[PDB]
């Protein structure tokens, strides 16, 4: 009721989630997502992630694992609970278990 789910992903994920209704244009006509491909750059990803951070109506972030690999330093440096960032891996490629921001916090685990 309060905030807006946001997603950054390849065409597959963003399509599938906009099917699910995850998506909004603010009063300034600005999306809460970013379609990213080979033509999208790393610095643009980081800048748009910070743009999401600036918004007060986000709550949740949905990052494809490639994108997480691309901007690892930005994700790790942002040790904030306000964006409950969740990692999710892509379609054609293996599940991403290592390099999880929370599994490193645990030590007595796999």
């Amino acid at each position: 009721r309060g905030k807006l789910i946001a997603v950054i992903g390849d065409e597959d994920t963003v399509t599938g989630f906009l099917l699910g209704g995850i998506g909004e244009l603010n009063k300034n006509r600005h999306p809460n997502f970013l379609v990213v491909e080979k033509d999208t750059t790393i610095n643009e990803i980081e800048d748009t992630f910070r743009q999401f951070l600036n918004r007060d109506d986000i709550g949740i972030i949905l990052i494809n694992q490639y994108i997480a690999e691309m901007v690892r330093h930005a994700l790790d440096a942002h040790q904030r609970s306000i964006p409950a960032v969740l990692e999710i891996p892509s379609k054609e490629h293996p599940y991403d278990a290592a390099k999880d921001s929370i599994l490193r916090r645990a030590k007595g685990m796999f």
Partner: protein, 208 residues
């Protein structure tokens, strides 16, 4: 610094003794709180992976149904990304007091806005509704996992705070107080001894 500055007297003994008892009670309570918070932490850890694996299989199935819909309607991706005005699902930030700490937690609210039905491209709505279910279940499970995530991080920070407090009371306060107490006891015994000596002296002199 090694001792709390108080002049020796019986009052000092009683007050320091009360303060010492208090220090032990407070330590013992904080230890117990830390134990409970550790338990809740570990309980979170026990379910994170199960949620992650159910996540994995669900998303795999749903993006498969997406591939099938792409076979059916061809290029509905372009029109669906074209059609973004309003969402039908929001997130509600509510609280949980599992302990004295305040815990952030989320709920999957459904606004109910009309979805964008697509039928023009060879009438793929049969695949599209199948997708509307496959991805919707995934979204629900996401909201749950995110709730778990934020709870985890806040819980971690709180438990470290309590551990700091326990160490502070355990390795600093108690030795200082008990050292002070021993010093007071020694001073009082010395004073009583001096009084005894003086009285014995006058008593011995009384013979003459």
């Amino acid at each position: 610094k090694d001792r709390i500055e108080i002049f020796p007297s019986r009052m000092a003994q009683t007050i320091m003794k009360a303060r010492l008892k208090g220090a032990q009670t407070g330590r013992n309570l904080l230890k117990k709180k830390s134990d409970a918070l550790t338990l809740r932490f570990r309980q979170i850890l026990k379910k994170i992976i199960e949620t992650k694996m159910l996540m994995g299989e669900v998303m795999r199935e749903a993006a498969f149904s997406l591939a099938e819909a792409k076979f059916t309607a061809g290029d509905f991706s372009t029109t669906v990304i074209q059609n973004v005005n309003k969402a039908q699902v929001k997130i509600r930030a509510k609280k949980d007091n599992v302990a004295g700490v305040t815990l952030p937690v989320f709920e999957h609210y459904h606004e109910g806005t009309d979805s964008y039905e697509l039928t023009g491209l060879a009438r793929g709505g049969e695949q599209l509704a199948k997708l509307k279910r496959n991805y919707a279940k995934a979204v629900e499970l996401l909201v749950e996992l995110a709730s778990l995530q934020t709870s985890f991080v806040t819980l971690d920070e709180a438990i470290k705070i309590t551990n700091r407090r326990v160490n502070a009371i355990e390795h600093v306060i108690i030795p200082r107080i008990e050292r002070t107490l021993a010093y007071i006891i020694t001073e009082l015994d010395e004073r009583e001894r001096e009084e005894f000596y003086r009285l014995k002296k006058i008593q011995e002199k009384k013979k003459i």
